[PDB]
Amino acid sequence: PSVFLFPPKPKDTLMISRTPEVTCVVVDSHQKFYVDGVVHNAKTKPREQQNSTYRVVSVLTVLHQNWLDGKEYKCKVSNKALPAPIEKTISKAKGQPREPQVYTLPPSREEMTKNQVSLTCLVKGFYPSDIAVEWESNGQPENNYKTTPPVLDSDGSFFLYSKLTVDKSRWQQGNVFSCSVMHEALHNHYTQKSLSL
Amino acid sequence: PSVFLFPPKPKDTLMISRTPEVTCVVVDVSHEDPQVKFNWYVDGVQVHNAKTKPREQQYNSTYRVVSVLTVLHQNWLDGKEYKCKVSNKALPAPIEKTISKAKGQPREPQVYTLPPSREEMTKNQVSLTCLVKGFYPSDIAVEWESNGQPENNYKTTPPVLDSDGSFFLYSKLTVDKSRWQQGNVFSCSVMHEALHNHYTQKSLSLS
Ligand SMILES: *[C@@H]1O[C@H](CO[C@H]2O[C@@H](C)[C@@H](O)[C@@H](O)[C@@H]2O)[C@@H](O[C@@H]2O[C@H](CO)[C@@H](O[C@@H]3O[C@H](CO)[C@@H](O)[C@H](O)[C@@H]3O)[C@H](O)[C@H]2NC(C)=O)[C@H](O)[C@H]1NC(C)=O
Ligand SMILES: OC[C@H]1O[C@@H](O)[C@@H](O)[C@@H](O)[C@@H]1O
């Protein structure tokens, strides 16, 4: 039995409307489960579900503020097929947060030969790497997009690119598209950047 | 004892000039019984000796042993399977690992260059972007050059699985704002199995 601790979803810790959570994944035959120190009885929930095996995952609700402040979260198991318990722990990356720079980019000229085109959103200069990116069109969520994971830049900050694919006609008809970015160092943890021919 | 199988580098398989190889590594070899035998198979063949080449190395309280197998460019591009078998007197049973290029039909990458945003040109440095999409497998190499010389200040994202099963990525070249305004021509080089001579390039300039 090996234990893995996971951090909340970037977007979750950035909006009071949603719930950030730490997930403790215990993988793997063919059964038990502190934050900044302080012993027994939850803020948790867990469960036992199912290749051949167990995996008693436990989910804890974290306070948005508490996580952003760097508090530690310690997940201690307790099994009798293990010499000693496994206490994995995790916290938000350390260091001065840095505000993301957002830039939308039109499809390349050479691309306007295909029936679909690529709308690009460059997001650089941010720290920590936790961040959420989404697209919209006049108030409606675009589904066909992909974003690259964060990449460490030469100066200690991170970047990534988000790619929205849209029919060339929709881009020809002048529709406007927006790249939404959520990060802790953004005013109101949110900035939107628009794109259009 | 642990075994890890590493494939060759993207460019090694694409240029007959280079030497593509497969590296098998064993860590946590017992200090007492440090003897390790390697057996290599290319598509199940070759239990018997072939190229291969080990060494031996002592660490914290264990031994690390590396075996290197040179592969033929076309063998790798033709999907051949490479198996590394590691045996040790202190092992219940040998350990086997197999590697190859991903299964699927090669897809030619589409390479588009993108100038910096108008909104970024207010900074002392801008971003020249190169989009590489629609390729498979993900094994690929991307580089930048301005003239005949290599631009060193760039970062490439790792490939990302797109909606149609192909891969894409972006490489970002950072040049002083001044250079890009001076009309310098920059170039994105992409090397892949599905490209003509396993290569293509795209220019990016202000005009
Ligand atoms: C005994 O020591 C060796 C070597 O430890 C070195 O660690 C580095 C950081 C160096 O600064 C110094 O501290 C030591 O020389 C340990 O060997 C390591 O074993 C792990 C296996 O878990 C290897 O990890 C694997 O790495 C590859 C990529 O390289 C990944 O693809 C795998 O998924 C996996 O992460 C690691 O490469 C080994 N490091 C070296 C230098 O070979 C060894 O673990 C340690 N004793 C133990 C705990 O077994
Ligand atoms: O559950 C996720 C974890 O699963 C393990 O099997 C490994 O793949 C880890 O690298 C990973 O963090």
Q: What CATH number is attached to the domain comprising A132? A: 2.60.40.10
Name every residue whose Cβ is closer than 8 Å to that of residue A45 and which is 6 or more positions away in sequence. Answer: A58, A59, A60
CA distances from B197 to B9, B108, B191, B192, B193 (A): 17, 12, 9, 9, 8
In DSSP terms, which residues pair with B132 in a beta bridge? Answer: B111, B169
* Dist. CA A53–CA A37, nearest whole Å: 32
Burial class (CB in 10 A: 0-12, 13-18, 19+), B15: middle
Backbone phi, psi, residue B162, to 5°:
-90, 180
Contact A33, A44 (CB under 8 A): yes
Contact B65, B26 (CB under 8 A): yes
Handedness of CA B156, B160, B163, B166 (dihedral sign): positive
Domain hosting residue A56, numbered range: 1-91
Residues A125 and A76 in one domain: no
Residues B96 and B111 in one domain: no
Residue carrying structure tokens 């080089």? B189
First to last CA, chain B: 59
* Dist. CA A6–CA B1, nearest whole Å: 27
Atom of ligand 2 nearest to the CA of A25: 1
* Dist. CA B7–CA B138, nearest whole Å: 13
Contact B183, B205 (CB under 8 A): yes
- Of all residues in chain B, the one with the smallest CA distance to A146 is B162
For ligand 1, which residues put their CB under 6 angstroms from it? Answer: B 2, 4, 27-28, 59-60, 62, 64
CA B196 to chain CA centroid, Å, is 19
Contact B22, B7 (CB under 8 A): yes
* Dist. CA B42–CA B62, nearest whole Å: 29
Residues A78 and A99 in one domain: no
Report cis status (omega within 30 of 0) of the bond before B137: yes
Residue carrying structure tokens 């920590």? A128
Residues A19 and A77 in one domain: yes
AA letter at A158: F
Alpha helices by DSSP H, listed for chain B, are 10-14, 73-77, 177-181
Report cis status (omega within 30 of 0) of the bond before A10: no
* Dist. CA B135–CA B170, nearest whole Å: 13
- CA A83 to centroid of ligand 2, rounded, Å: 22
Residue A56 tokens, joined: 């008693």
Is residue A195 in some structural domain?
Answer: no
In DSSP terms, which residues pair with B82 in a beta bridge? Answer: B42, B99
Residues B1 and B85 in one domain: yes
Backbone phi, psi, residue A3, to 5°:
-110, 135
Contact A56, A33 (CB under 8 A): yes
Closest to A179 in 3D by CA, of A156, A152, A161, A158 = A161
Residues B189 and B125 in one domain: yes
